């Protein structure tokens, strides 16, 4: 009675979850745009009507791909640069006592040492200024990395500024984007669209604070893989930014020492004028309002009558303990102790000042045996940035106490990549299909 | 908005979605980063050639909507056309019948050769 016969259809709209390799799309720098495809001036997006998809930000291969690509680019950028192997020599250092305050005492060391020259016969005696975090006593001192590995000096012509990068899928695949506001990164998104490429993402490297990020369109958002478990980090996204102004006011001077044929080492000659600590400034009232919004949102998940505590970081390495970042090629580590210090109970123009310490020998990624030397920058440095998110970790969490304490977190940079690709997924099309029909060949 | 285009008919019914197969058909083809791009292009070309070969083996070469001689078994599906072509989406049907895919392919493949042999025999006379 049915007399139904099989029929083959090509081009059926069906997709399945899959993993593939995405490629560049962009409009001297570390993030090489030379080998990255030009971006279309008029990108196209197609809203899918009456289509609800499943999303989960904590199982995204895009984050891993981005991390691998960023690490590969960073490794590639440093290949054609000078290797500071001869620098591992016995230094003779003294304290700097020339126009310093009570907080910068012992921070700088004036060192002298012998070094090679272009000719392999002669030697030259030179001097330099080093930071206390870079020299370890063996009056005799040595570089911290000498007993681990010798790393290359970053070339002075490349720039560390982040450039937006768009990720595009290959032919036969598609990228689905969730346009549903108040979506918390896990569950069914009912509003979906297909996009040829991902919006511009700045690969900003920072810890304890998300800088120059994207802002929520509705209100403060809280995300976590398992909020009940304390071992899982909590990502907080603001709906408005907070301005932070970070400056190093020392007037540095750069000098070149010829250590070999076509090989120059850049050193800090001397500081002109006064010496004082670099520091950051953050608005107080804006920070208080942001923390009020954050605690209001946190009360939804962790009870209405609970006490919410913000305190200092537990401890560990300087990178995870302090807010680490860079400004104009100068690597800052700031002490964010005055911000996350307060208690909340259910019921003008002053600015918070964060002192910061500068570093030159850098191990950016969590790797051992590959450091990097940042050449000094000439003149004072200043910059302004937007705080648009936080990474928090719960302390304890046992049922014995009703007070919840949140502390700053960080360390793993994948989270910085997970705060931007939380509304994207990749699928592959399956055009072939079989159905019943009334035909007869 | 660009509601219609490529996958815009994903949420529509099968009857409505069958009218726009061409938009999906067109897009199936189109230093360290270059290697990844080349690998992706090679995989895409291989997938397209595999799909084209599978279509060709069944005798539906160069056709988007091609019916065949293999009859439909009621065991695989019991729903009638009344509640399928206008009361269901392609995604739902594919999810429902993802189990019973290969048998129909084999039946089509073995059916095509018999038709070819019969055509040769008829033309022999």
């Amino acid at each position, epitope marked *: 009675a049915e007399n139904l016969w099989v029929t083959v259809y090509y081009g059926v709209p069906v997709w399945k979850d899959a993993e593939t390799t995405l490629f560049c799309a962009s409009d001297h720098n570390v993030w090489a745009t030379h080998a990255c495809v030009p971006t279309d001036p008029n990108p196209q997006e197609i809203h899918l*009507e*009456n289509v609800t998809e499943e999303f989960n930000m904590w199982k995204n291969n895009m984050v891993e791909q981005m991390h691998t690509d960023i690490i590969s680019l960073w490794d590639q950028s440093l290949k054609p640069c000078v290797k500071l192997t001869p620098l591992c020599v016995t230094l003779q250092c003294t304290n700097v006592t020339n126009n310093i305050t009570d907080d910068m005492r012992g921070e700088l060391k004036n060192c002298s040492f012998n070094m090679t020259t272009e000719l392999r016969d002669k030697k030259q005696k030179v001097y330099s200024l080093f930071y206390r975090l870079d020299v370890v006593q063996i009056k005799e001192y040595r570089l911290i990395n000498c007993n681990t590995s010798a790393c290359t000096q970053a070339c002075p012509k490349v720039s560390f500024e982040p450039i937006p990068i768009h990720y595009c899928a290959p032919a036969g695949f598609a990228i689905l984007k969730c346009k*549903d506001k108040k979506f918390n990164g896990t569950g069914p998104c*009912p*509003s979906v669209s297909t996009v040829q490429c991902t919006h511009g993402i700045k690969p900003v490297v920072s810890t304890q604070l998300l800088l120059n990020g994207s802002l929520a369109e509705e209100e403060v958002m809280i995300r976590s893989e398992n909020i009940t478990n304390n071992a899982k980090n909590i990502l907080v996204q603001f709906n408005t930014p907070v301005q932070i102004n970070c400056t190093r006011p020392n007037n540095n001077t750069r000098k070149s020492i010829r250590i070999g044929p076509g090989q120059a080492f850049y050193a800090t000659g001397d500081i002109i004028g006064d010496i004082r600590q670099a520091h950051c400034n953050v608005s107080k009232a804006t920070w208080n309002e942001t923390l009020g919004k954050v605690v209001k949102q946190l009360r939804k998940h962790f009870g209405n009558n609970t006490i919410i505590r913000f305190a200092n970081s537990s401890g560990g390495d300087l990178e995870v303990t302090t807010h680490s970042f860079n400004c104009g090629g100068e690597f800052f580590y700031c002490n964010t102790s005055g911000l996350f210090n307060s208690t909340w109970i259910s019921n003008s123009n002053d600015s918070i000042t964060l002192p910061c310490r500068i570093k030159q020998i850098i191990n950016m990624w969590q790797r051992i045996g590959q450091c990097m030397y940042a050449p000094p920058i000439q003149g004072v440095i200043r910059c302004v940035s937007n705080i648009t998110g936080l990474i928090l970790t719960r302390d304890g969490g046992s049922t014995n106490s009703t007070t919840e304490t949140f502390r700053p977190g960080g360390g793993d940079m994948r989270d910085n990549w997970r705060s931007e690709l939380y509304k994207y997924k990749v699928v592959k099309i399956e055009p072939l299909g079989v159905a019943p029909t009334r035909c007869k060949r | *908005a660009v509601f219609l285009g490529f996958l815009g008919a994903a*949420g*529509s*019914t099968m*009857g*409505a979605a069958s009218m726009t197969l061409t938009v999906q058909a067109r897009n199936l083809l189109s230093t360290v980063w270059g290697i990844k791009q080349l690998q992706a292009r090679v995989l895409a070309v291989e997938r397209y050639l595999r799909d084209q070969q599978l279509l060709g083996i069944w005798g539906c070469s160069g056709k988007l909507i091609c019916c065949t001689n293999v009859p439909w078994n009621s065991s695989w599906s019991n729903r009638n056309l009344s509640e399928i072509w*206008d*009361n269901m989406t392609w995604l739902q049907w594919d999810k429902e019948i993802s189990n019973y895919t290969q048998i129909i392919y084999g039946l089509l493949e073995e059916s095509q050769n018999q038709q070819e042999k019969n055509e040769q025999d008829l033309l022999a006379l």
Partner: antibody, heavy 126, light 107 residues
Framework: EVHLAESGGGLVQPGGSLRLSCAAS????????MHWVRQTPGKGLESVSV????????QYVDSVKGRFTVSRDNAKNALSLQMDSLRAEDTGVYYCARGGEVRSRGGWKNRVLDSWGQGVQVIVSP | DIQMTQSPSSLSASVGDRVTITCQTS??????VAWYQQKPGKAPNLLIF???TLQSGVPSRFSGSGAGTEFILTISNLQPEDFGTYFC?????????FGQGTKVDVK
């Protein structure tokens, strides 16, 4: 053209009874669901009751459940609403509407009130 | 019963202005939401059904969109004949609840 005409409204005291009739033409009456809707003065629309094509399925809102009865005559293509124990809140304009089957752009079929009558006034005051 | 909430309650707009009316539901109703217009002393007239399909004969300026529990009616080019009370109705399950109505009048 679909035509619906209401009649039987007027003034009634609280606790009284009243019948509203709706004459329909221009379509297949037996194959269309019928809706009784009311609009109170100064308020929005509200669906009072619904009756199916066969006349066996009838539904009402909680505000009128147990007091309002909806019936249909397919032979005469007529619809009837009996109201009993009328209250002051029942005052307003009553419309008889047809739930017509329509096809969405995606290919799904549902029913909407695509045709309405002119309406009839009922005033429940002492 | 599913309750329907409209916004704004009332609005004053001039000829040629773009009018946007939002309608919200407590529970999902798929996309079975219909937008009607009412003039003074006249019965409601259907404009949108299915939350995105335009009724035959209606001018193209009227459009509808949305998903989940949020739907939007858009009048791109307000005309003298489009002033009145707009309502959004859900017809997924009985009872079919209407909105409180948005009144658009001449400024």
């Amino acid at each position: 053209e679909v035509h619906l005409a209401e009649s039987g409204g007027g003034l009634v005291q609280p606790g009284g009874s009243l019948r509203l009739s709706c004459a329909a033409s221009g379509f297949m009456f037996s194959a269309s669901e019928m809706h009784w809707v009311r609009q109170t003065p100064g308020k929005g629309l509200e669906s009072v009751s619904v009756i199916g094509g066969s006349g066996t399925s009838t539904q009402y809102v909680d505000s009128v459940k147990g007091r309002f009865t909806v019936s249909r005559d397919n032979a005469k293509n007529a619809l009837s609403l009996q109201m009993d124990s009328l209250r002051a809140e029942d005052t307003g304009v009553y419309y008889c509407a047809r739930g017509g089957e329509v096809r969405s752009r995606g290919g799904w079929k549902n029913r909407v009130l695509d045709s309405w009558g002119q309406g009839v006034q009922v005033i429940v005051s002492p | 019963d599913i309750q329907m909430t409209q916004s704004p309650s009332s609005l004053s707009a001039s000829v040629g202005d773009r009018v946007t009316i939002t309608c919200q539901t407590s529970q999902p109703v798929n996309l079975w939401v219909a937008w009607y217009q009412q003039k003074p002393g006249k019965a409601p007239n259907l404009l949108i059904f299915g939350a995105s399909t335009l009724q035959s004969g209606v001018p193209s300026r009227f459009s509808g969109s949305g998903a989940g529990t949020e739907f939007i009616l858009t009048i791109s080019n307000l005309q003298p004949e489009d002033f009145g009370t707009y309502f959004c109705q859900q017809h997924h399950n009985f009872p079919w609840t209407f909105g409180q109505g948005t009144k658009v009048d001449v400024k």
